[PDB]
Copies of this chain bind each other. A is one copy, B any other.
């Protein structure tokens, strides 16, 4: 099953990085700039994993993740370029499977996605 990942990230640079990282794993990558685009994609395509920025114009990413979790149990990892404990624990608490801070090893990211996808993609 070709894993499908959705990246919710408004910064073009960060989003292109992430996207090329996962295309290199053989994933199909979908992109979203905000919460409307996120729900649009989640409605119309199969999505096995969401990577979301906590920090995000419009509705914040914690809130988007809360909403996501009310509707779906899809695998979810948060991103932050701010190491900040409260945001880390909150995001885990609302049900993110992982929390990754800048700067990250791409390898850590794709191995964590692979292990998580191995458990959730049934």
Contact = CB atoms under 8 A, between A and B. Distances in A.
A107 B92 CA distance: 10
Oligomeric state, in copies: 2
A92 B119 contact: no
A88 interface: yes
A101 interface: no
A115 interface: yes
A3 interface: no
A11 interface: no
A36 interface: no
B108 A88 contact: yes
Interface of A: 85, 88-89, 92-93, 95-98, 105, 107-108, 111-112, 115-116, 119-120
